[PDB]
């Protein structure tokens, strides 16, 4: 199968050509909003933290992959790990309010406190990258506070993706990487 | 009398990635409109099937020509841990799930002047010998020639010919040879072609398939 | 694209682009590369309190130089740049008397050489580039793109959407498209090629809508 | 649609659950994906 | 048996901010019949549509002619923190909010004497240059000018032009220029109107909306 | 548009009188009954308490809002976080009351304790102002009483307003009034 | 009506979880606002 190689368009050949025989696919796990629907946990430093899932790792999962995107929407979900009240303030709140109560503030119940938060930026989506680098101020899903906060997570629901961003993987030092998988106990 | 239930013990735990939804605080919400907005993407998949991107043979993606005749231009294992992937975008998605089955896709786009002329043979030598060093002996094996002209591209598929119906995109300590074999890239003959380069990249075949996501990495 | 007469020695697949006031004609295109859609979102939205409007006349072409690719230059060497850059005339005149706006482009980059150099160039438009790494070049071909390679074609033609976390920008501090070139396969030259290729670039700023009228001076 | 499986509807209205989003007026790679080139451009013999 | 549950967990926290409803007590309880008292309203929003409140310059609502000709009565920025809207209702209600859209509308009730007459005009700067001091050069944005006569009031409405669908109602420190813009509005000319009141007052306008409530105050 | 200002009547333009289009608008969140239905924190002194809501705090969003109108009805929803028992007694009540159990009491399960209590004062509405100041004593929702009242808060069901009164901002020191609010990491 | 997004109907009775109001015998800055003059009272060139 010759192509004109330069146009850019599209090829995908298939065992047929020579004789195989092309099978089924069931992708479910390679699908966009499933992957990313899922928790991560992010690196909190203080007992108040502004909710921002560039803060995944670039090499864990979702932030692995949300980062092969450049731009994308979704609602969030929050498992957090604290002490006190929690409270949450949406995007673009003055960070004074974290100190007020009738916000959505949640009382302790350990271990971990549950809650589900609307997309609340005012773009029409964000990015992951941007050239006019520093990610500005808007990009964010509003700022959580509680007098302590051992852990935070978070989950991307409904997740949607635009314009694919590259993803590697790790550089093998020699021909392929090797390494040590789930094996059963030897015995 | 209320409705007498059971709190069963072993029941209710967190878990990071329960099917469930938590409940909500801040509602009446709305979005600003996003309709339309351009490039959306649904499955990566399918990216993978669109894009091919390039494999890499010591800090490049094309190989070259050494000189005319018989000639072993390249020959890799068939893992997507292959140090001829990892800058390619198929194995930076792979290395999020377990196993995978499926058809993978080789490209290759030959860049020689006009006066520069090349016939090249690809095969894919399974697992159970050694893969051969010359054409000959790897002629025996799911193979393919062809030579350059006006289509400077030339795409084949790579078989999913395994014991199992999936495999891993992993690669275990214990295997000292790629379990799935390996493909080795020739070149049969040129004239006026030596110095060229034949850069290649891969996609996704129809068939291919990824399962059993997995979270390996630093952190 | 396609010609007719027969065959031949020489080149075919003609394609005259046209945008306002000036044409391209190229008689060895390897057709023309679509963004990441065909036509764009809504260009009047409630951003705009609709007082939104779209010029014409800055849908034309204007020209601009990128390099030499010389065969020293070999794999990954890379030149960016952000669209619009500097721009003048009609289209930057809007730049300076309108607060907001948008566009999309229609590019052709041309390294005119000769058919008897071996080497290829890869050139792509991308959305929020910012600094790609080396591994990363090898993915660079999920951005909108398009092969040179001499024994083939002399021009590369992508046309692409606006794009954006807004409806409508300031150019005046971001701009989201960045169109790259790089060299993949370093040029060769051996008897008759051409010694250097110079590289330009066809632009014409596609659908370009502006909003919110400045005050001015001059 | 995500990692998501109760069978039975949520309790509190969609309203409250998620945010809601607006229109003004199938995607992209898929459909570009499936425009791929599968033949084989040139002539078959045997 | 009884039916078997999952209590999980992260489940049941209190929540100042729950859209549930707690369990009742006193029950059977009648109020005194409250059919048709005057002055209900029903979303904040309306009152701020119909009741237009002052702006303010140093102390006071109106603007006053300095002298006959070309001058430039007020500028200022289009932010509902303002120190002009201040004293205003639009801006006491915004306070709750983190984002806006929408069109504002401000009202100039000419309060001069019958031999007084006058020409204004009023412009909205959007971001991306200096404020004009002079109409020429404000002349080119959208503008309006009037003179006095038997209609002592003039509406005008300053239109939502922003990057994103929504703005902050808030101000940040890092934010040098307000970042909507200016409206300046000047006096072209006069005539025995110097000394004369403009007084300002602004209303909310049709599309004009207010959201995503919060509590950020002393306590 | 010119108009006679003195009227008083309405007036309202739009965007469309020089070219412009007014757009659409969902104030869901200035809709009153909504806005006052969340719980804000009331300063309990003593451990017995008599419920009013004009003592929410007058620049919090809820006491706020309340006060930008002159009468006002509503049903109470309370959430105390207290010790032993609970006893609440309905407006009118003899305060000798609060002892008895037999009343309206609930016993401790901590940390909070929720109710839902019934308007209860003997007015068709209640106010916010009055001129005939120091609000009169009918003008509560009962009392509340426990050996412990570390906290209180209160919420507003079925919120009725009625005549609006202003509401204030702050008075900017400059031209406009900046401060901090909330952005993501810097890193 | 307020902050209240539960989709099943309360355990409760109404009459329990709140007040019965009575009556003897839409409103207000809702039918105020919109009677709003928005034309020109002038006469229009262009």
Redesign the interface.
């Given at each position: 199968?010759?192509?004109?190689?330069?146009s850019a368009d599209?090829?995908?050949?298939?065992?047929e050509?020579?004789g195989?025989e092309?099978?089924?696919?069931?992708?479910?796990?390679?699908?966009?909003?499933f992957?990313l629907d899922?928790?991560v946990k992010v690196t909190v430093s203080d007992n108040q933290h502004t909710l921002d899932v560039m803060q995944a790792?670039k090499?864990?999962?979702v932030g692995?992959?949300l980062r092969?995107?450049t731009?994308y929407?979704s609602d969030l979900?929050?498992?957090v790990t604290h002490t006190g009240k929690l409270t949450?303030v949406?995007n673009g709140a003055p960070v004074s309010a974290l100190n007020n109560t009738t916000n959505?503030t949640?009382y302790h119940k350990g271990?971990?406190t549950?809650?589900?938060?609307?997309?609340?930026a005012?773009?029409?989506?964000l990015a992951t990258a941007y050239t006019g680098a520093h990610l500005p101020t808007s990009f964010n899903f509003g700022a959580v506070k509680a007098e302590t906060i051992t852990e935070l997570?978070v989950r991307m629901?409904r997740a949607?993706?635009?314009?694919?961003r590259?993803?590697?993987?790790?550089?093998?030092t020699?021909?392929?990487?090797?390494?040590?998988?789930v094996?059963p106990a030897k015995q | 009398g209320i409705?007498?239930?059971?709190?069963?013990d072993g029941?209710?735990?967190?878990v990071?990635?329960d099917?469930?939804?938590?409940?909500?605080?801040?509602?009446?919400?709305?979005?600003?409109?996003?309709?339309?907005?351009?490039?959306?993407?649904?499955?990566?998949?399918?990216?993978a099937?669109?894009?091919?991107?390039?494999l890499?043979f010591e800090?490049?993606?094309?190989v070259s020509t050494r000189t005319d005749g018989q000639r072993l231009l390249a020959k890799?294992?068939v893992?997507?841990?292959?140090?001829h992937?990892?800058?390619?975008?198929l194995?930076?998605?792979?290395?999020?799930?377990t196993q995978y089955?499926?058809?993978i896709?080789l490209?290759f786009?030959?860049?020689?002047?006009?006066?520069?002329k090349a016939r090249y043979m690809v095969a894919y030598v399974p697992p159970g010998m050694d893969a051969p060093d010359n054409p000959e002996e790897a002629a025996h094996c799911?193979h393919?020639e062809?030579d350059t002209?006006?289509?400077?591209?030339?795409?084949?598929?790579i078989?999913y010919i395994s014991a199992a119906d999936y495999t891993?995109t992993?690669?275990?300590?214990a295997?000292t040879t790629?379990v799935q074999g390996w493909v080795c890239v020739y070149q049969i003959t040129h004239g006026?072609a030596d110095?060229?380069?034949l850069?290649v990249?891969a996609?996704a075949?129809?068939?291919?398939?990824?399962?059993?996501?997995?979270?390996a990495?630093?952190? | 694209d396609k010609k007719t007469e027969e065959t031949t020695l020489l080149e075919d697949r003609i394609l005259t682009t046209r945008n306002g006031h000036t044409t391209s004609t190229t008689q060895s295109s390897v057709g023309v590369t679509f963004?990441?859609?065909t036509?764009?979102?809504?260009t009047s939205?409630?951003?705009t309190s609709a007082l939104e409007t779209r010029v014409h006349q800055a849908e034309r072409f204007f020209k601009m130089a990128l390099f030499d690719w010389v065969p020293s230059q070999n794999?990954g060497h890379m030149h960016k740049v952000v669209l619009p850059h500097e721009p003048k005339g009609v289209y930057g005149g809007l730049v300076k008397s309108y607060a907001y706006m948008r566009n999309g482009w229609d590019v052709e980059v041309t390294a005119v050489g000769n058919?008897?150099?071996?080497?290829?160039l890869l050139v792509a438009l991308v959305?929020e580039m910012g600094d790609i790494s080396d591994?990363?070049k090898?993915?660079l071909?999920?951005y909108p793109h398009q092969?040179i390679?001499?024994?083939?074609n002399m021009t590369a033609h992508i046309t692409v959407?606006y794009?954006g976390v807004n409806r409508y920008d300031q150019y005046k501090q971001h701009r989201p498209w960045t169109l790259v070139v790089m060299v993949?396969?370093?040029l060769?030259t051996?008897?008759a090629?051409a010694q250097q290729i110079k590289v330009y670039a066809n632009i014409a700023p596609t659908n370009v809508h502006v909003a919110g009228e400045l005050p001015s001076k001059e | 649609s995500g990692?998501?499986?109760?069978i039975i509807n949520?309790y509190?209205?969609q309203?409250?659950?998620?945010?809601?989003?607006?229109?003004?007026?199938n995607?992209?790679?898929?459909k570009?994906?499936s425009s791929?080139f599968?033949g084989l451009?040139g002539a078959l013999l045997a």
């Open positions: 199968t010759t192509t004109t190689g330069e599209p090829v995908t050949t298939t065992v050509n020579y195989g092309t099978q089924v696919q069931r992708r479910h796990h390679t699908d966009v909003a992957v899922r928790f790792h090499d864990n999962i692995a992959l092969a995107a731009y929407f979900e929050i498992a949450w949406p959505p949640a271990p971990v549950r809650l589900a938060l609307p997309y609340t005012p773009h029409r989506v997570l629901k949607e993706l635009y314009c694919p590259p993803i590697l993987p790790i550089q093998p020699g021909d392929r990487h090797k390494q040590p998988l094996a | 409705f007498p239930v059971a709190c069963s029941y209710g735990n967190m990071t990635t099917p469930k939804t938590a409940d909500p605080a801040y509602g009446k919400v709305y979005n600003p409109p996003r309709t339309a907005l351009p490039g959306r993407f649904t499955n990566y998949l399918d990216v099937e669109a894009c091919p991107t390039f890499m800090n490049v993606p094309y890799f294992d893992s997507l841990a292959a140090k992937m990892s800058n390619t975008y194995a930076g998605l792979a290395q999020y799930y089955t499926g058809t896709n490209h786009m030959f860049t020689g002047p006009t006066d520069a799911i393919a062809w002209g006006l289509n400077s591209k030339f795409t084949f598929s078989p891993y992993a690669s275990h300590e295997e790629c006026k110095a060229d380069a850069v990249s996609s075949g129809k068939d291919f398939e990824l399962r059993l996501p997995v979270d990495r630093q952190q | 963004g990441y859609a036509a764009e979102d809504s939205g409630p951003n794999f058919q008897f150099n071996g080497g290829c959305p591994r990363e090898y993915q071909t999920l092969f390679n001499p024994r083939t959407p794009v993949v396969a370093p060769t051996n008897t090629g | 990692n998501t499986g109760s949520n509190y209205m309203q409250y659950q998620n945010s809601m989003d607006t229109q003004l007026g995607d992209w790679f898929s570009l994906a791929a599968s451009f």
